[PDB]
Design an enzyme around this catalytic site. Sequence first.
Site, PDB file in Angstrom:
ATOM      1  N   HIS C  96       7.517  -7.424   5.141  1.00  0.00           N
ATOM      2  CA  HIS C  96       6.368  -7.659   5.999  1.00  0.00           C
ATOM      3  C   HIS C  96       5.385  -6.497   6.124  1.00  0.00           C
ATOM      4  O   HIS C  96       4.312  -6.662   6.707  1.00  0.00           O
ATOM      5  CB  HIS C  96       6.867  -8.058   7.386  1.00  0.00           C
ATOM      6  N   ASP C 119       7.241 -14.737  13.732  1.00  0.00           N
ATOM      7  CA  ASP C 119       8.245 -13.737  13.385  1.00  0.00           C
ATOM      8  C   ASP C 119       9.247 -13.609  14.526  1.00  0.00           C
ATOM      9  O   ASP C 119       8.942 -13.949  15.667  1.00  0.00           O
ATOM     10  CB  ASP C 119       7.536 -12.390  13.194  1.00  0.00           C
ATOM     11  N   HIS C 121      10.301 -10.799  15.260  1.00  0.00           N
ATOM     12  CA  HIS C 121       9.898  -9.483  15.746  1.00  0.00           C
ATOM     13  C   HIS C 121       8.380  -9.329  15.809  1.00  0.00           C
ATOM     14  O   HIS C 121       7.638  -9.965  15.046  1.00  0.00           O
ATOM     15  CB  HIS C 121      10.477  -8.391  14.841  1.00  0.00           C
ATOM     16  N   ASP C 123       6.937  -6.526  15.220  1.00  0.00           N
ATOM     17  CA  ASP C 123       6.615  -5.531  14.202  1.00  0.00           C
ATOM     18  C   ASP C 123       5.392  -4.738  14.631  1.00  0.00           C
ATOM     19  O   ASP C 123       4.423  -4.611  13.890  1.00  0.00           O
ATOM     20  CB  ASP C 123       6.333  -6.178  12.843  1.00  0.00           C
ATOM     21  N   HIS C 136       8.222  -2.177   7.662  1.00  0.00           N
ATOM     22  CA  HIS C 136       8.038  -3.620   7.757  1.00  0.00           C
ATOM     23  C   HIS C 136       8.161  -4.062   9.209  1.00  0.00           C
ATOM     24  O   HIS C 136       8.122  -5.251   9.496  1.00  0.00           O
ATOM     25  CB  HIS C 136       9.052  -4.381   6.902  1.00  0.00           C
ATOM     26  N   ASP C 227       6.910 -14.641   8.761  1.00  0.00           N
ATOM     27  CA  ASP C 227       8.083 -13.843   8.403  1.00  0.00           C
ATOM     28  C   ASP C 227       9.197 -14.868   8.424  1.00  0.00           C
ATOM     29  O   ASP C 227       9.454 -15.474   9.462  1.00  0.00           O
ATOM     30  CB  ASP C 227       8.319 -12.767   9.464  1.00  0.00           C
ATOM     31  N   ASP C 229      12.115 -14.752   8.886  1.00  0.00           N
ATOM     32  CA  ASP C 229      13.171 -14.542   9.862  1.00  0.00           C
ATOM     33  C   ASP C 229      12.771 -15.080  11.235  1.00  0.00           C
ATOM     34  O   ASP C 229      13.535 -14.998  12.195  1.00  0.00           O
ATOM     35  CB  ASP C 229      13.572 -13.060   9.924  1.00  0.00           C
ATOM     36  N   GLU C 272       9.581 -11.694   3.688  1.00  0.00           N
ATOM     37  CA  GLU C 272      10.998 -11.385   3.891  1.00  0.00           C
ATOM     38  C   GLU C 272      12.071 -12.241   3.223  1.00  0.00           C
ATOM     39  O   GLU C 272      13.234 -12.161   3.602  1.00  0.00           O
ATOM     40  CB  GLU C 272      11.299 -11.284   5.389  1.00  0.00           C
TER      41      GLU C 272
END
Lengths: 314, 314, 314
Positions: C96, C119, C121, C123, C136, C227, C229, C272
């Site tokens: 990412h 996401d 997260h 980030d 990332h 992302d 995830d 990711e």
Amino acid sequence: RTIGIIGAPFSKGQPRGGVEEGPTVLRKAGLLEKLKEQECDVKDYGDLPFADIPNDSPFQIVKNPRSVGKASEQLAGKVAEVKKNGRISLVLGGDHSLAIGSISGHARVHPDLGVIWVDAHTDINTPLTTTSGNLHGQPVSFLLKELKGKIPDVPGFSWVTPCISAKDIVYIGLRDVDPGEHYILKTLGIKYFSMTEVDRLGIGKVMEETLSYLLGRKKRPIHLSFDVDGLDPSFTPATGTPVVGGLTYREGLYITEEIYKTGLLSGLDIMEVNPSLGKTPEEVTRTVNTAVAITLACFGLAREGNHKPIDYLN
Amino acid sequence: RTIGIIGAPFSKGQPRGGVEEGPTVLRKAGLLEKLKEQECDVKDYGDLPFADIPNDSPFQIVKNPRSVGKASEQLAGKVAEVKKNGRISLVLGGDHSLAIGSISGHARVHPDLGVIWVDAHTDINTPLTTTSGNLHGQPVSFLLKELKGKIPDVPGFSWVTPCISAKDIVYIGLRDVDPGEHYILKTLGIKYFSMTEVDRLGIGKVMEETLSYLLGRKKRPIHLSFDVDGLDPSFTPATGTPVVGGLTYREGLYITEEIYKTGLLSGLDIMEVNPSLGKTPEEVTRTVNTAVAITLACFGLAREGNHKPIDYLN
Amino acid sequence: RTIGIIGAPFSKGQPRGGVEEGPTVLRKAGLLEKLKEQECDVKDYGDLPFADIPNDSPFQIVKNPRSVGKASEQLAGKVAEVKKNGRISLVLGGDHSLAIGSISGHARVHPDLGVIWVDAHTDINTPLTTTSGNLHGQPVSFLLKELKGKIPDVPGFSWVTPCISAKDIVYIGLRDVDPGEHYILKTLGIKYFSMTEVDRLGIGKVMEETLSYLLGRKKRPIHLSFDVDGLDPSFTPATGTPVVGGLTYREGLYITEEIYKTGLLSGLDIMEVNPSLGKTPEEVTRTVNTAVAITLACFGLAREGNHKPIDYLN
Ligand SMILES: [Co+2]
Ligand SMILES: [Co+2]
Ligand SMILES: [Co+2]
Ligand SMILES: [Co+2]
Ligand SMILES: [Co+2]
Ligand SMILES: [Co+2]
């Protein structure tokens, strides 16, 4: 938040052994440390020594009555103790029969408490409606004031005195209720949100109502009885009485995140975690890990994040 | 509720064999007994003997036309029979092509019926829009009055007469629709709730609307065509045409619990259960068990519990 | 829709290698062909050759700074190029951290863009708040105008110039945010929908608001940073930083189906996907397949079906 941890390695409320290991695997999973990792003040009151009662034949249909009523009586006084120490009692336990002692020990110090019961079952069978005789499926019948006069004099429960009324409890996650149990729900007008209501309204509304229901009139101390089987078995497999179509990991975290935010949580129970019933070591950790996250959520852990009252950018 | 069970071991509406075993594994799973365990009056009309039609070459692109139209014709008369006996027809079947006979046999006795079609597919391809030729993906095109004149004279379906209109059917759970099928949806203004609508509104609203849509004007008999592939494959793996992102166990039970509560269910189909397509014996039981719970829900089994009109506290 | 495909085999924004294979497995999965199977105009701009930077010691705590800033700088110019060619840039990537180059290359041509960041997260760690040093998990801190003056002069990012403001970005799916990250969220008043909000409101409302939030005032070009995830690991297992309780397959498709329908998507990132982190070859395809469906949804694939502007009944 400030907690009072009470280990309760008991299992005589149901048939399968190994649920008495719950406090052990939960502690080992690092629960106490993870709590302190937050804004938590934690005091471990140790694991209660539930001495054996070799002479505990059945009472009609009820199994291990003297053993059960005893561990509840012992737990009630401990819970009362920690609540006297101005601490939220966290009862890490074995079977759900221990709810009798927790809610009782809680109400002694806080007679105006409200109860939220997350479980796949209402556990409100009377020693007379129960078809199995397992006391981890009857705790509620022992605690209701309306049912006082319907419950027999069971060996081990003379100390017991109904502390909660039908309109002070909410059920969430129901999907396996016996007929007699259902008759009690409708007759005493108990408020509940079975999986049907959850699917219909969403967990957000269900919680909105549940809270409005128990705190609308006025603010009162909340006691959360969480039976790990309330959540779907894909999340908490190692448990004695699993039932498909349960609350999701997310719904479980949502329930607790919301409870936390009320700032009224005063009593918490984490029940039915049985390491021995896991088909794989991964089902055991998957259960324990799920059990921990729910606890942490109860004391502040929020999915959107957390931060101290400081300037992180400096 | 009072049912009329009809076993339909048929599979010629699709390529894979083994779906003809559905009535067998479902019965063995103890479905008839579980129904009687409720407030159900059950009469088993046996499993229909679908004799072979050795001479059934394709019709253009359509596969096994004579075999298919025949099993539907036979089923239609059986369904009509049981509806004449004042019983909800429960058609435990093989492939979904049998919907033609069920809905037809149903409408003969109840020309004002409304259809709810829980499926991952609209199964509304015409013998001319179908690219596979499998009739278990065309049943609907045969039953719509608006499409009468677009469907060719297929060997085995001369007895057929479009009994349902586009505004008398609702689809729920769609996630794999062909282009021609989609063109028919929009052009005839058919009401549907694809997984997109389910995610958007929730299953509670989706059902609210679906019911309001089909019963608003007036109350009418409901025919529920449930294709087990409408539910996610993590719940009903052993099925020929699975598709990810399906309705959940809970959503499936919610749909049916709601249908039951209308007290208007008069026709039910449990289709596409193929024991042979299970990768493990656990996927087979997971499917069958899921298939049974949905059926029971249709006839009264409620997740919040059930109880007879008696005093359980005595 | 008309796309500009950009392969970005990069991994230096995080520790595990193999995420640089993402563009490869995605292409092999047949993504480009599946896009053309729709109403899509596709132009492959090839896979960017991210030459090594052997001399890239850490910068304080930040890992591979020169390697990272370089691949972003290279990507930014490519994205700018394709946007100049009137094509939606599809950046199939590795980690990412490449979001810095994409969003930057996008804004050069479209300074009024809105960002949606799906996401687990945020980030948004600064090189000073990051505890891991993996870039990332910091892309966002580099792109915000409000944080300009808090970010150090990191080797490889001199070309960088904050192109997005705090009120031009929405986060969806958050469930693992660091404290400093959370402090930045609340302080700059960034709009987000963590899993808590998703559970509370539903994905339908969450999207309603997100879109109203970013397009209410006026219509603007949308950049979607996805992302993998953000979705639950049961759907996208092969990824470096998985987190339980993620968005569902359906929620992921809903998010994107809605984005598509705005007709404002101008920038897309699929990040990711790490084939090497799959515990089984089925976890790898389950991830890739999930990754493809999300992409297709972005460009028109609708679960209720699709059809050309023709008469399918003829
Ligand atoms: Co339970
Ligand atoms: Co319980
Ligand atoms: Co289907
Ligand atoms: Co079907
Ligand atoms: Co992430
Ligand atoms: Co990310």
